[PDB]
Structure formats: C-alpha cells, structure tokens
Amino acid sequence: QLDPATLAAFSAAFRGELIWPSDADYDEARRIWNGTIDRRPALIARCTSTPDVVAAVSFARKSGLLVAVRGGGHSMAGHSVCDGGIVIDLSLMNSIKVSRRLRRARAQGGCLLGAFDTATQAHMLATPAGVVSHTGLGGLVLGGGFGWLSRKYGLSIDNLTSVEIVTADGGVLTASDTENPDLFWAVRGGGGNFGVVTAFEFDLHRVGPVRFASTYYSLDEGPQVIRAWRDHMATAPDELTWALYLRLAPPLPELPADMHGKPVICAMSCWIGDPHEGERQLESILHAGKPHGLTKATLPYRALQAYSFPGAVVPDRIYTKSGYLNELSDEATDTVLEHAADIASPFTQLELLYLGGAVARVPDDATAYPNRQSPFVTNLAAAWMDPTEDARHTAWAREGYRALAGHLSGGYVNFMNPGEADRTREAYGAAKFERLQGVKAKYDPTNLFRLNQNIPPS
Amino acid sequence: QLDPATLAAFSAAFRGELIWPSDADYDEARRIWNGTIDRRPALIARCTSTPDVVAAVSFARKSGLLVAVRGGGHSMAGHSVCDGGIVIDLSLMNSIKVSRRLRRARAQGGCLLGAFDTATQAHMLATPAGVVSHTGLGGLVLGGGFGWLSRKYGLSIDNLTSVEIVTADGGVLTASDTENPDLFWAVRGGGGNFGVVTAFEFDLHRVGPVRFASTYYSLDEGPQVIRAWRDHMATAPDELTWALYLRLAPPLPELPADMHGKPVICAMSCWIGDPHEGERQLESILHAGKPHGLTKATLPYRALQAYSFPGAVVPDRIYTKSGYLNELSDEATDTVLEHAADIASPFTQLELLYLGGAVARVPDDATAYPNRQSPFVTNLAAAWMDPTEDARHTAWAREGYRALAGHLSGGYVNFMNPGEADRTREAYGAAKFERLQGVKAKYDPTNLFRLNQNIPPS
Ligand SMILES: Cc1cc2nc3c(=O)[nH]c(=O)nc-3n(C[C@H](O)[C@H](O)[C@H](O)COP(=O)(O)OP(=O)(O)OC[C@H]3O[C@@H](n4cnc5c(N)ncnc54)[C@H](O)[C@@H]3O)c2cc1C
Ligand SMILES: Cc1cc2nc3c(=O)[nH]c(=O)nc-3n(C[C@H](O)[C@H](O)[C@H](O)COP(=O)(O)OP(=O)(O)OC[C@H]3O[C@@H](n4cnc5c(N)ncnc54)[C@H](O)[C@@H]3O)c2cc1C
C-alpha cells in the first residue's frame, strides 16, 4: 500500500496505462515468456514515452518499490516481473524510425525483434539481432545480442551508435562514443544495471535475399556431423553461418514419419552474401551426413528472421544452462550426443552455435561483453508444458551442463536461468566486472535496477 | 503560412514531432512508397497518441489545410502525402496488445503488418492481412485487405471487431456492431473517408506451421498452368490458396541461369491446415507444367508473411492497373500470357489471384467492401527505378488492362493508381456508393478527409 500523494504525483506525470492487481488486464500483463515465473507485481506501468519512464523510475525510487523492467519479457531468468514492486513495462513503446539515406534506425526500448526487422527491411536494410521474431530488443541488445548476421556484422552492440537512457535518479541521458562514454561502454554488454533505455540507434547494412538451408541428421551420424561442423567453422568465411539444434524431430511432412519425435540433429545454415555463392557453399556443408527433410530457399532477411524454429510451437515452461567453449573436443562431442539421445520434451533443444567472425575481431575491452574470443556457445534449453514434469526437464539441462562443465567457461548473461544470480562475476570476469562496478556506483549507486544479471555498486 | 495563435494552440496540445519544410526530417518524411509522387506538405505531424490525432485534425480544420493521413505509406494512388497541407502521420503509433486468452489484438493506426504478425505469432495467433510485411495495417484494412489467410478466414475487415476513430469534428468514437454501426459498416471497405482509426481490434485464429511452395513455369506451358489454376480454384477447398505472378525470373540460384530475366509464371501456394494434408494438396497442383526453381517448406506463419516477394527488392517507382473477374476465359488467359512476355522491368508483376472462399460467403451488404462474389483479381503492377523510363512501364500496364477490359469489373480501392479518382463509383457500385455518401454526410459533411478513393458527402 502506497502514499496517496506520491502515486497522485507519479500518475500526474504518466500518460500510459496503470494495471493494478484488481484490474482486468493484470494477470496477462504480468505473465512473461518463462511460465515457471509466477510473480504478482504491486503495479504494472505500461509506459508510452520517455517522460513516462522518467515518472515511473522516480516514483519507484522514493516509494521504495522493487523495480522490474520489461522489454519483450523473454528473460530466461524471469527478471521482467517482480513480486510486490513495480513493472516498468515498455512493450507499448515499439516505434522504429528508419532513414534510407542514413542506413540508421532509431528503435524504442520495447520493440520486438520482428517489428525492428520489418521496418528496416522496408528499405532492404538490417542489423544483427536474435533469431526468434518476438524477442524484445531491449533485453537482447543490452546483453550483447547475436543471430544470423553476427559472424558477418558483429553483435547488436557492435552496431549500436547511441542510446537514450533514464538513470536511477530520474535524469535523461544520451550515451554514445562522444557523450557519457563510460556509460556507453557499460550498456553494451551490462544489461539493465544502469537505467532504462528508451531508444536505441543502430547502423544498418544492406541485406538482400540470403540462401538458407535446414535439414535433419540421424544421431547415427551424430559424430561425423558435429566433427565436420567444428572443423569447418574453424576456417569458414564470415559469410557462412551454421548451427546445430539437437532436438526431437518435429512431425513435419518433409521428414519420414518414422523419425518423428526421435532425437535428431537439426542443422540450420545460411550465407550472408550472393545466393549463388551461398548455393555452392551451403551444399558443400550440407552432406556431412544424409540430410533428411532438406529445405533450401532464397529468403528475404525478414523471412530468415521469422523461420526459427521448425514447428513454431510456443512452450509454456523453460530452463536454460549455457556456457562458452574455446574448443569442442571429440570427448565433448560424445557427451553432447549421449545427452541429446535422452531428450524427453518435444520442445527441448541442445543448441551448439558458432560465433567468432566479426564478433571476435572487436577488441576485448571495447565493450562490456565478455568472451568474444571463445567461439562456441552451447545452450541446454529445456522447454515443456506440464508443470508436474518440471524436475525431469531441468534435470536434463542440469546434467548436460555438468557433464560438459570444464569445457565450459564464462556465460552469456541473456541465457541465465532464475537460479544463476551468482554467475555474474564468472560470466564477465574480474576485470570487466570491476569496471562495471565503477560505472554502477556512478550512475546507479543505490542499485535501483537490480532485477537483471546485477552488478552491485562500488 | 498560418495563424500564430492556433498554431500555438495545436503545438500546446500535441505531444508528437512536428516536421517543417526546413527540418532535417522533411525530405524523407514526405517520401512514400510510390516514388512517382513528389509532394511537399506544409507540415508533417508525427502523432504518438489518440489525443495527438485529435489535435492535428482540429488544427487542419481551423486552418483549412488539406489533410493527408499516412499509415504505412503504401498508397498506390499517393494519398498519404499532400502538396501544401498537413500530413497526419501515424507511423510512430505502432503498438499492439495481444491477449492470448481472448484471441484478441489491438493495433494502433500506424502499425506495419510485420509488427502486427510478430505480435500475434508470439502466441501462435494470426488474422488475415497482406502479403508484404512493410505495408501499413491502417490503409489496408480500411479497404478490406486480403492475403494468405483470406480464403480460410476472410478479409481483414471480416475479423475487425471495432475501431477507435477520430472524426472530422475532432470527436473520438467507437464503432462496432453495437456502437455507431452505420460507421462500422463504412470503415470496413470505405477507406479513410470517415476519420482516423487510431486503434483496430481483431479476432485472432490459431495458425501453426503452414506448408508452402513457390515455383516457376515457362510461358511455353503458360496455357495449361493458368487453365489448371482457374479450373482447380473453382473447386478448391478453402484451406488451399494459390496465386500466380507473371514476371521476369529473378536471378536466383534455384533457377537455371537460362531463365533469369525471362518472362515466367511464379506460382506460390499454401495450405492453411495440417502440413501433411498440405503436402499432398500443394503437390497435386504443382505439376500442370514442369516446375522450376522449386522451393517447398513448412513455415511459421510469420515466415510466410515475410516471404513475398522472391528477390526482395524495393522498387523506387510503381504504377498499377487492377480489376476483378467473375470468370477467366481462354481468350483472357491468352491475353495475359502475351502481355507478360512484354514485361520489361525486373520488378514488374502481372498478378492473378483467386479470392472466393470465406470472402465470398459474407453477404454482399454486410460491409462496404464490394465484389466479394468476383473470385478473380488481376493487378498489372509496373515497378521500376529509372525516372526517364516512366512512360514505357506505365504504357505496359495501361495496354494490358485495356486488352482485358470486358473481363474486368469493379476495382479494389487499395490498388488504384493516382489517375483513377474517377473509378470510385464503378468500384463500389451504385448501391454501396449511395449508402456510403449517406454515412459521409453524417461524419464528414465538409469532406475534410478527401485524399482517398474519395466518397463525396450526401
Ligand atoms: C525464444 C528466445 C529466443 C532467443 N534468441 C536469442 C538470439 O537469437 N540471440 C540472443 O543473443 N539472445 C536470444 N535470446 C535471449 C534474449 O537476448 C534475452 O532473453 C533478452 O534478455 C530478452 O530481452 P527482453 O527485453 O525481451 O526480455 P525482458 O525479460 O523484458 O528483459 C530482460 C532483461 O533486460 C532488461 N531490459 C529489457 N529492456 C530494457 C530496456 N529497454 N532498458 C533497460 N533494461 C532493459 C530487463 O530489466 C531484464 O533484466 C532469446 C530468448 C528467447 C526466449
Ligand atoms: C508492396 C505492396 C503489397 C501489397 N499487398 C497487398 C495484399 O497482399 N493485399 C491487399 O489487400 N493489399 C495489398 N496492398 C495494398 C494495400 O492494402 C494498400 O496500399 C494500403 O493503402 C496500405 O495501407 P497504408 O497505411 O500502408 O497506406 P497509406 O499510404 O499510409 O494510406 C492509404 C490510404 O489509407 C488512409 N489511411 C491510412 N491509415 C489510416 C488510418 N489509421 N485512418 C484513416 N485513414 C487511414 C490514407 O489516408 C490513405 O487514403 C499492397 C501494397 C503494396 C505497396
């Protein structure tokens, strides 16, 4: 229960919608993508402008409310909703200005990935983002952000030119390489720790149709497939991106009915470049084993962005255990294959991704993002429906992570699960963490923004 | 030049951006998708809320500025920009609230399709719209709106449940089957004639993966393909959509270099339903001639929405000629095939679409959309780059339209070119045209919204 004059003051400054536990659209506004997170915020504040976030940030500050900030609500830690505090919901701020002469896009802090790519591709432009269209932009970009364009153009933070950000004291700041450049260093990898970002500006690149391929390998050929992949990507051009999603086979018509719901290697690849070059390049790598249900297409980039994932089903409940690898040993290959063979839910994926390329040529200390030079990412992403099966699906992800343990180092802040608050120092490393603390003490000394992979101040 | 006091009164109420002919955002804010129209407005008002629209409408009224409304800027007639007046520019009003429980979407008047179907596909939901993702939702819906889901679920207006609309006197209204139902009839097919729809509400349907195929046929086999298409669609189930676009083959690696830049039939089809049923159904319609550059895939609906068109090139300049057909005789099939062989630009398409289905089971008088009972639509959509070549490409579409004339009737308002103001009555028919003037006399008696397929009051 809140001081009547202070809410009266907040709401006086707010143009958006307030949702209270007793209102209609409360239960749905407070659900987030990770259905295992069931929290009841004291107030959801769906902001509609930079001034509204200013109002919300200050209200929460002297009311003492715990502050959750919501972009697209895809936090695998469930950070975008709180019990008993305030949700600063940016989901209605999803505008995107795109300048065709500038190759520039100014996007609001609540954009969904697909809204951004729709607007940029109106001029055949694009910049790197994640692969699932309904991910929010805010949480992905603030943690680094990678997808199909990353090997050629870098992380999302590698194409960020500025932010407009609301700091914990209510102020509005511009952060670029020429304005508040400590802050601009922290936001490019340091999550929500330093204020609410209400507008990202990106440099955009011209991306026409990309030649794309998706196929399925039996586990029989599991070794030959993954060893071919790790060897090829060691020397592959930036233009080739190639990923492995180990999963139960989706019951799609392009695959024989006999493999349906059997573990497979789903391999997806594309070529950011001339599709004829992609046609030869992709087929050079498509046949490490016998490809089942081969799909080959020249897609607009926006269609590439909307393709993931085969079967297009939205899981209710989630658990992710992820890490980086400097090299994928044949013993690490045998253990990913033995754990894949025991996947139970039809929505679970053991993803093996190769980064590197443009991401690894950016100097390490340029941004807050860690482990640029570790080129493998592995994500044991459990995803199911039935709440009574929670234990066994998280047990699957826990035990795949443990059996890989020492091969793994660091960690992507945006793949952390709710029980991994203590991974923050080891994900960044002592050096980056300790500089991030220096920025935290300066811009958020009270730690008003602590629902995130949080860096305490000092 | 305008009144300092009411300018100041408008500025005071307006929370958006203003763009003057001296502002750095002017040249690009005033360009729309049809490059052929070059118009310099006195003021571009980039609204951010409904009261913002209330202020820009009243200001134009008091000052007598000709009002253009812009949603997505895709007006084939050029209606979203004006010389010397004010643009009410909705492109920043892009937010979409999607309720999973209700299968309901609320979309602001400036949404693009790609943001809309990103928003709904986060819950495996969808409702019909166009086939190109950067088209604005506002103008498309107010004209009816058809796309991949239309034969199964009807027009975009067949799923609209209410609109929030700002009328010429500055008042804000709700129009539905329950509230001002005369107006709710008029906006469903009558364009921007009755005010600025600041919010569209829709019923959504569950649309999982959809089996999809695109392929190309030589004009050698043009006659049998198009006859099989017209014979099959007369009997096809609603779940089968099948469209033909005659064009120059794009230089894509799936096609033999021999066909690049040569006139072909690009056939695209999909099954809204079980993909295993869909594979059998698309496969039964794929071989009326030898299919080349064949792409088959099981896509998330958002990926289907993002696919058109193969090559993904945005044309600078467009001119279109379009009409309906109750029947596609062999004399017309000939005429279509011969004019397609004369296509000179690599972005020009001769579109032959089959509607019908759920579109044609809505009683004619239920909305303002005309010609549900005509299942065929053909659109000669010339699109090029060179401004010194305008006559050539405009000539191609005029003379193709006129070589079909007697087969063509009515005309989709959303496909009219800047010279076709006269076609408003033939497109609606006399009965609908007279009923719409009746509504126009009530809600826009001064014809303040006249930059549309305009319906004069009385
Ligand atoms: C299905 C799925 C696919 C994914 N694919 C990819 C992928 O391809 N690549 C990749 O790199 N990651 C990917 N991710 C991870 C994604 O980057 C993170 O989950 C991200 O944090 C989600 O962003 P969000 O704002 O939508 O989530 P939220 O839960 O709304 O926010 C996450 C965190 O960011 C903070 N935050 C969000 N917006 C702002 C803002 N505007 N200002 C300040 N702080 C903010 C929140 O406070 C919170 O701590 C994926 C996640 C999912 C669930
Ligand atoms: C590449 C392309 C693909 C297309 N594909 C399809 C398709 O598959 N199916 C189909 O049916 N049509 C299709 N169209 C046509 C489309 O429906 C129309 O061009 C439509 O006008 C697009 O709306 P818009 O808001 O983007 O256009 P705008 O230029 O922004 O607006 C067009 C008209 O609508 C009015 N208007 C716009 N928004 C509002 C509003 N909120 N309130 C009141 N009036 C408003 C404007 O004043 C103007 O009169 C396509 C067009 C293009 C260019």
Is CATH 3.30.465.10 the classification given to domain B95-206+417-444?
Answer: yes
- Over its C-alpha atoms, chain A yields an Rg (Å, rounded) of 22
Q: Is A7 annotated as a binding residue?
A: no
Q: Measured between CB atoms, does A295 come within 8 Å of chain B?
A: yes
Contacts of B128 (CB under 8 A, 6+ apart): B145, B146, B147, B148, B149, B150, B153, B154, B155, B156, B158, B159
- Tokens standing for residue A284: 């050079």
Q: Cα(A330)–Cα(A327) distance, rounded to whole angstroms?
A: 10
Distance CA A74, CA A89 (A): 13
What is the C-alpha separation between B374 and B323, in angstroms, rounded? 10
CA B246 to chain CA mean position, Å: 19
CA distances from A246 to A270, A348, B405, B452 (A): 18, 8, 56, 53
Q: How far apart are CA B105 and CA B161, in angstroms?
A: 10
Q: Which helix (H) or strand (E) holds B20?
A: none
A148: DSSP letter:
T
Nearest to B41 by CA among B456, B348, B451, B455: B451
CB A458 within 8 A of CB A441: yes
Chain A, residues 61-100, CB within 8 A of chain B, namely: 91-97, 99-100
Q: How far apart are CA B47 and CA B64, in angstroms?
A: 19
Fold category of A207-416 in CATH: Vanillyl-alcohol Oxidase; Chain A, domain 3 (3.40.462)
At position A80, the amino acid (one-letter code) is S
CA A353 to CA A242: how far, in whole Å? 7
A278 close contact with B: CB closer than 8 A = yes
Among A114, A295, A313, whose Cβ lies nearest the Cβ of B297? Answer: A295
* Helix (H), strand (E), coil (C) string for B246-293: EEEECCCCCCCHHHECCEEEEEEEEECCCHHHHHHHHHCCCCCCCCEE
Residue ranges, CATH 3.40.462.20, chain B? 207-416
Phi, psi of B425 (to 5 degrees): -75, -45
Q: Which residue of A has its CA nearest to B110?
A: A95
**CA A267 to ligand 1 centroid distance, Å:** 24
Residue A115 to residue B113, Cβ atoms within 8 A: no
Q: Count each helix (H run) and each strand (E run) in chain A, helices first.
A: 14, 19
Q: Where in chain B is the domain with CATH 3.30.43.10?
A: 16-94
| Mutation site, A89, A93, A95, A283, interface B, largest B CB count within 10 A | A95
For chain A, the first-to-last Cα distance in angstroms comes to 32
Residue ranges, comma separated, of all CATH 3.30.465.10 domains in chain A are 95-206+417-444
Ligand 1 pocket test: which of A75, A355, A424 has the largest number of ligand atoms within 8 Å of its C-beta? A75
**Chain A partners within 8 Å of B121 (Cβ):** 114, 133-134, 306, 312
A140 assigned to a ligand binding site: yes
The residue among B66, B54, B58 whose CA lies nearest residue B90 is: B54
Given an 8 Å threshold on Cβ–Cβ distance, is A275 in contact with B296?
Answer: no
Cα separation of A67 and A69, whole Å?
A: 6
A123 touches B at CB < 8 Å: yes
Q: How many secondary structure helices (H) and strands (E) does chain B include?
A: 14, 18
Report residue A282 as tokens.
């992709």
Shortest CA distance from B29: residue in chain A = A99
- From CA B19, how far away is CA B379, in angstroms rounded? 35
Could you give the residue ranges of the DSSP H alpha helices within A158-300?
A: 181-187, 222-235, 275-285
* Residue A357 per-residue DSSP state: T
- Can you tell me which atom of ligand 1 is nearest the CA of A449? 47
DSSP summary character for residue B112: B
How far apart CA A68 and CA A177 sit, in angstroms, is 28
Atom 3 of ligand 2: nearest residue by CA position:
B132
Contact check, Cβ <8 Å, B296/A295: yes
For A423-452, b/e burial (b = at least 16 CB within 10 A) is bbeebbeeebbebbbebbeebbeeebbbbb
Fold of A16-94: 3.30.43
CA distance A92 to chain B (A): 5
Residue B412, marked binder = yes
Gap from CA of A180 to ligand 1 centroid (Å): 24
Edge-to-edge strand list for the sheet holding A67-70: A17-19, A43-46, A86-89, A67-70
A188: helix, coil or strand? coil
Phi, psi of A313 (to 5 degrees): -110, 140
Contacts of residues A233-236 at CB distance under 8 Å and 24 or more positions apart, as own/partner, are A233/A354, A233/A356, A233/A375, A236/A354
Determine contact, residues A28/A38, Cβ cutoff 8 Å. no
Instruction: Judge: A122–B314 Cβ closer than 8 Å, yes or no.
Output: yes
One-character DSSP codes across B352-412: EEE--GGGGGS-GGGSS---TT--EEEEEEEEES-GGGHHHHHHHHHHHHHHHGGG-BS--
Strand partners, B293: none
- Given a contact cutoff of 8 angstroms between Cβ atoms, the answer to whether A260 and A271 are in contact is no
Distance A378 CA to ligand 1 centre (A): 18
Element (H, E) at B331: helix B330-340
